[PDB]
Design a protein around this ligand. Sequence first.
Ligand SMILES: COc1cc2c3cc1Oc1cc(ccc1O)C[C@H]1c4c(cc(OC)c(O)c4Oc4ccc(cc4)C[C@@H]3N(C)CC2)CC[N+]1(C)C
Ligand SMILES: [Mg+2]
Ligand SMILES: [Mg+2]
Ligand SMILES: [Mg+2]
Ligand SMILES: [Mg+2]
Ligand SMILES: [Mg+2]
Ligand SMILES: [Mg+2]
Ligand SMILES: [Mg+2]
Ligand SMILES: [Mg+2]
Ligand SMILES: [Mg+2]
Ligand SMILES: [Mg+2]
Lengths: 213, 211, 214, 215, 211
Amino acid sequence: DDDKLHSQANLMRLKSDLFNRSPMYPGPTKDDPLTVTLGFTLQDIVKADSSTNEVDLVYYEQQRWKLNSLMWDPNEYGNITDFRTSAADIWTPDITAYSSTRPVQVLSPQIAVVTHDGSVMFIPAQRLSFMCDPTGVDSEEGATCAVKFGSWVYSGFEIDLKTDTDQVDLSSYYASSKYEILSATQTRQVQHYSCCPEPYIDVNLVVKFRERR
Amino acid sequence: DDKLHSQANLMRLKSDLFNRPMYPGPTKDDPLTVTLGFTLQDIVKADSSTNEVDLVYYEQQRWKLNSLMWDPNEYGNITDFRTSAADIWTPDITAYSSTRPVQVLSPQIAVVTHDGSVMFIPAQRLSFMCDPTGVDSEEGATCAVKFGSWVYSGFEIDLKTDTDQVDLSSYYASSKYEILSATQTRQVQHYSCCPEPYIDVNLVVKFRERR
Amino acid sequence: KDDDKLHSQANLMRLKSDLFNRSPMYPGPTKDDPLTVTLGFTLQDIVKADSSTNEVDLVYYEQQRWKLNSLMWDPNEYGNITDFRTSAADIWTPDITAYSSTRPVQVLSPQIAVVTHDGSVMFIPAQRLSFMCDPTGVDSEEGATCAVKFGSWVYSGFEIDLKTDTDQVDLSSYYASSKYEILSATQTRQVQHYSCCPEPYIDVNLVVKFRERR
Amino acid sequence: DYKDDDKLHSQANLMRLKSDLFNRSMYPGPTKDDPLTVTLGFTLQDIVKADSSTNEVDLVYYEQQRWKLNSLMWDPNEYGNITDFRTSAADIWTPDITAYSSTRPVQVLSPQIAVVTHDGSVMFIPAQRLSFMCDPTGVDSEEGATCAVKFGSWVYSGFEIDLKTDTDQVDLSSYYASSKYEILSATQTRQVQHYSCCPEPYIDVNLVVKFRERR
Amino acid sequence: DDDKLHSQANLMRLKSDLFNRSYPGPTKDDPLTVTLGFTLQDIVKADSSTNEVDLVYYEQQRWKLNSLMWDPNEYGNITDFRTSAADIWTPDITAYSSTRPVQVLSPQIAVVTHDGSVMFIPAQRLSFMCDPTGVDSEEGATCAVKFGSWVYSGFEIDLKTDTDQVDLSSYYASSKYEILSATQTRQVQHYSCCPEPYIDVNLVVKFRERR
Ligand SMILES: COc1cc2c3cc1Oc1cc(ccc1O)C[C@H]1c4c(cc(OC)c(O)c4Oc4ccc(cc4)C[C@@H]3N(C)CC2)CC[N+]1(C)C
Ligand SMILES: [Mg+2]
Ligand SMILES: [Mg+2]
Ligand SMILES: [Mg+2]
Ligand SMILES: [Mg+2]
Ligand SMILES: [Mg+2]
Ligand SMILES: [Mg+2]
Ligand SMILES: [Mg+2]
Ligand SMILES: [Mg+2]
Ligand SMILES: [Mg+2]
Ligand SMILES: [Mg+2]
């Protein structure tokens, strides 16, 4: 206790200084662009509906970005290096699947981890239905599917996207899924439209899969 | 540092426009024109036992409010910004013959530009009334649904399209259904119940089972 | 030009702010100040009849009308505004409910009303309803008959009286390619008395006879 | 008129009343020193469905809830003779009466509004659709299937919340005449239970239904 | 009638002092132990087309904060109380291999005791990754799902069970599935990326079609 009481007190002081003086960060702009790193950890192809061409995925989607406005000096806060906080208390990026066919279902607590250098890690678990023809899922080559993820409203001048590796993390893939993974890549792409001079960034999730035996 | 002066300018801009009374919507004396456009991504499902068809599309909405205007020079050259759709008024555009609530697939964020213009592009899945008869045939099926304001007549909201062609350039190439044609047409209507003019955009889609 | 537009806009702000205060939300009807709600249905589709569970699914506009002194204003003090649109959450709405649904109603329309300067309100929620209905004989010429009551969940006739403007359901919107065709569709006010109580209960009983399209 | 005045004055009596019970003053719930009796009663409307590949049955019913709070009493003569009012269920405390063996969330089908009367008593009657645990084995027979589900507080033991019924017969005067399922019997019975783990009594109302396919 | 007003004002008084005269979650300095146990009511559905299985259970969560302590003597000898689960902090315990959002079957209400202990027992319906193959045989099928904080390491939240027995005394005797065995076991996990320990409770269930 006491120190415990003071530890608590430090965090609460940190949280208020960060949030309640200087209202919420207004998102990136062309002047103050931001890079968002994404990585997918695929857990499960739950279902492949060949009457509709929809496949359902369960995955953890890791988001990392970093904001100056969220740094503090740990020395000033009883040496708190980082803390967990609700996603409602901070700006999060608007990363969406560009071809889902149902609202994404969130499977995990909406809480992020923020570090003293202003970097935020946020890892939502999701079930997604997206546009995918599962033809050849019963063959040796299996079926191939793709879905792009990106910011819904920000172009490349405000949000840049990157990955650590083009390899999707399969280390958590359900061993007894109806389907088995031949490959899972996650690839940064730059889209140019003719309408518009600004580039748009997405990460392309490509999965090649196949009925298990 | 300069990066912190931009944030500050934006925060200030948003506060001026939002924290200092939300537009109460259009009036006969002060009507609004909303531009609509569809980008058909997919016909996911044709249900011949209930006559329901499920579409996924982007729905572009565009409009312009004087009270959303600023002079960029007083805000460090900011020419536009992105903000939650909750912060502004948005039009009550709806499908007139859906059979399930629409399912919003994209985040509710809008871009506001310094001339007061707003662009909002919700992705949707919609079930609407549609007889898919003929879909298994060279000529395919034709379906139609209308969109417009739910509570404003054409004295308050007028609608408009940029082209009467649905944008099909992201239509999903391995859909169960290919598209023969897809058109979005402004229409003005007079109903016996109701003496005000009614404006809608008619979405007409001819489609067949892929081969 | 932009100046005419700003005053008219500010006159609406003013009207709203004046109505939605002094003296905030009207507490609902009483025995001393009862209220009459007119309903009318506009049937768009019988989407589905499930004979394995005896549930049928209707899509309709449920048109509701009523009048509140508390929502009156003089157009003259408000730059000639005779009516305006407002989210239904800003005002009191009646608790009209199907008595025999089997799923929560799904709302298919923005929930916004029209208030006119005499205090009258017009509110048109579009709905999809699953209600108890045995669709037997639907595949014959004489078809099936199903019925559902709508009324206030909690007010007696001493507080909310219902009426219809007509006993016919409005079919002008009915989908010409539904699996189901309408033979008749009526909407009739009924007064019920129970045995617990001395107060009457009012409902509009919606009766639909339908069959498969051939 | 001086009717348009009286009306105006009936509204202000109600708005005032609501203001004195609601803003001025919110029951923190029952306690061991201040227990509460909840009266429960069912009006069964329909057995909508019986899944025998999962052993779920879906019922539709209205659940009558009734209790009384000193803190909700008022003197009608101070309030223009108002003897009772309607109000959103969110303005008042309500009991956590729950099904103990539901299998998906209860579906509410009626507006959440209660009636409060000057003696401090509240009647609240939500219509609901419940999926609960039930084998319909033998539903296609003469003798039928039996199912049970208990209802009662989720977190209050009998020392804080007690339950009673006005009758043991579930009310069937609104059962749907053309349901797939007719009702052989439906009863609603107060049970008291005592566990080893625990000194306190546990109250529930046991809802039991014998039904068979309509034939 | 007057001592009921008293004891009532006392509780109100307590809730005031606890909740608005006044937890930001646990930390490395101030860690917290959550005790969990499961009461399994039903395996509703085992789906071989998708490899999902649906359970109905009560999940007891139990923990203790110094900040919720009080001295009964100063509060009419109130020894505990019930309160909405939004009035207080709760731990982010999460199934790590669910495939649908958990559905809540019970009122979101907790019991707070004067020593600052909190007990929270939500009823849930869950879908999780489970191959039901063999459920039709005598040896049944076996499925596991781990449960843990999503965002805190072992440095801030530790977990425990009072028993590794999943309590089956309320199992639905008429389920389609009979439980062969059901356990709930703490697990510590050490990774290559990370010095932090990671704790979960592993819910493992062996079950077969009822005979
Ligand atoms: C299958 O859909 C429709 C089918 C048919 C029609 C309109 C439809 O629907 C659409 C419906 C509106 C607007 C644009 C549409 O494209 C309706 C409307 C509405 C309002 C107020 C009302 O009373 C005061 C009312 O009756 C209304 O409903 C009508 C009015 C006329 C008709 C039917 C329903 C006949 C019209 N005719 C040619 C037959 C074919 C205000 C706003 N809303 C709610 C939008
Ligand atoms: Mg740009
Ligand atoms: Mg008009
Ligand atoms: Mg006409
Ligand atoms: Mg008008
Ligand atoms: Mg009465
Ligand atoms: Mg009465
Ligand atoms: Mg007790
Ligand atoms: Mg107790
Ligand atoms: Mg850690
Ligand atoms: Mg840490």
